[PDB]
Structure 1
Amino acid sequence: GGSGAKNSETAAKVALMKLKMHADGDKSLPQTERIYFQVFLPKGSKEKSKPMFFCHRWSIGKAIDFAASLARLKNDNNKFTAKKLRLCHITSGEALPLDHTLETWIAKEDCPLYNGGNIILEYLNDEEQFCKNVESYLE
């Protein structure tokens, strides 16, 4: 295709539905309780971030520990004496608690993370609340 790329509302809807289909999972599935999330790779050359299928009824922190297994990636989170892979906002460092669930925040008044959003995974201690700047690493 070409002709640049116009900007409109429909473009977001089509792009969203098209992305969910690419996300690691089933397209035919109802995905009524499960939502797709864009995880930012640490050193993803070809791609900066990859979509992943997650459940709304899953701990925010645990979501990472699980995704690491399903994706078959290397990371020391099961232990305690070692940095654990966790999700946090880009250019913020603020890392939500693992006891909190996605549906909880999404359903809550705040609702910081919305459907089709983006998130990055970095090695951060459980006790650690605010991590360094991720942008610095991807600079």
Structure 2
Amino acid sequence: GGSGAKNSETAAKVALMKLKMHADGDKSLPQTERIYFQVFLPKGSKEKSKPMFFCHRWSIGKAIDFAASLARLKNDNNKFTAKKLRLCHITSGEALPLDHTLETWIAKEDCPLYNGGNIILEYLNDEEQFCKNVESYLE
């Protein structure tokens, strides 16, 4: 990278390395529009949490397909009549719209979200849209 401002900018930089320090990646990444989020494991392995950042600001359809990969689970997002791991909103349960874009949600006035937020990963049919009890989402 390369930039100098301090005072305010430092607030974002210090916060970036803070999370990235635990996540899987170098604090100094090329993607300037990259995004960071905590991937809450489905709770069923040796690890409890699995942080990771990526410029998945694109369509949500790609996020899901990617989640299955990062989570090291089975998937395909094409020809499968089973349950797939999707990305839901934190403290909400609302499953991200696969037929929409992530940026749209960030610019949304009703839900002005941005990088640095939390995300949940659970096996939910593509037909789904909103999940209940974010805590018992996996039960």
Fold shared by both chains (TM-score > 0.5)? yes
Which runs of 5 or more residues in structure 2 are unaligned?
A: none
CA gap 1:138/1:112 in 2 versus in 1, 3 angstroms: farther
Question: Is the Cα–Cα contact under 8 Å of residues 34 and 56 in structure 1 kept in the other structure?
Answer: yes
CA contact (8 A) 2:35 2:56 kept: yes
**CA deviation digits over 1:18-66, x for unaligned, max 9?**
1124322333223312211111011167764322222254222421211
Structure 1 gap segments, 5+ residues each: none
- Conserved? CA contact 1:39–1:49, under 8 Å: yes
Residue aligned with 1:54, SS:
coil
Farther off after superposition, 79-88 or 2-11: 2-11
Moved more, 92-101 or 7-16: 7-16
Which sits farther off after the overlay, 102-111 or 39-48? 39-48
| Root mean square deviation, CA, Å | 6.4
Q: In the aligned structure 1, how far is the partner of 2:63 from the partner of 2:42?
A: 17
SS at match of 2:53: strand
- Shift in CA distance, 112/122, structure 1 to aligned 2, threshold 3 Å: farther
Q: Structure 1 99/3 Cα, relative in aligned 2: closer, same or farther at 3 Å? A: closer
TM-score by length of 2: 0.70
Contact kept in structure 1, 2:67 and 2:86, CA below 8 Å: no
| Number of the residue aligned with 1:55 | 55
- Matched positions, count: 139
| Higher share in helix | 1
Instruction: Summarize the Cα distance change of 1:4–1:56 in structure 2 as closer, same or farther, 3 Å threshold.
Output: closer
Compared CA separation, residues 45 and 85, structure 1 to 2 (3 A): closer
Q: What TM-score comes out, normalization by structure 1 length? A: 0.70
Percent sequence identity is 100
Residues 75-84 or 33-42, more deviating: 75-84
Q: More strand per residue: 1 or 2? A: 1
Task: Report which stretch shifted further, 113-122 or 22-31.
Answer: 22-31
From the superposition, tell whether residues 70 and 3 of structure 1 become closer, same or farther in structure 2 (CA, over 3 Å).
Answer: closer
Q: Distance in 1 between matches of 2:29 and 2:2?
A: 32
- In the aligned structure 2, how far is the partner of 1:49 from the partner of 1:55? 20
- Cα shift readout 1:81-123 (whole Å, capped 9, x = no counterpart): 1111111124533212112222221123233433211111011
- The within-5 A match list for 1:89-108 is 89-108=89-108
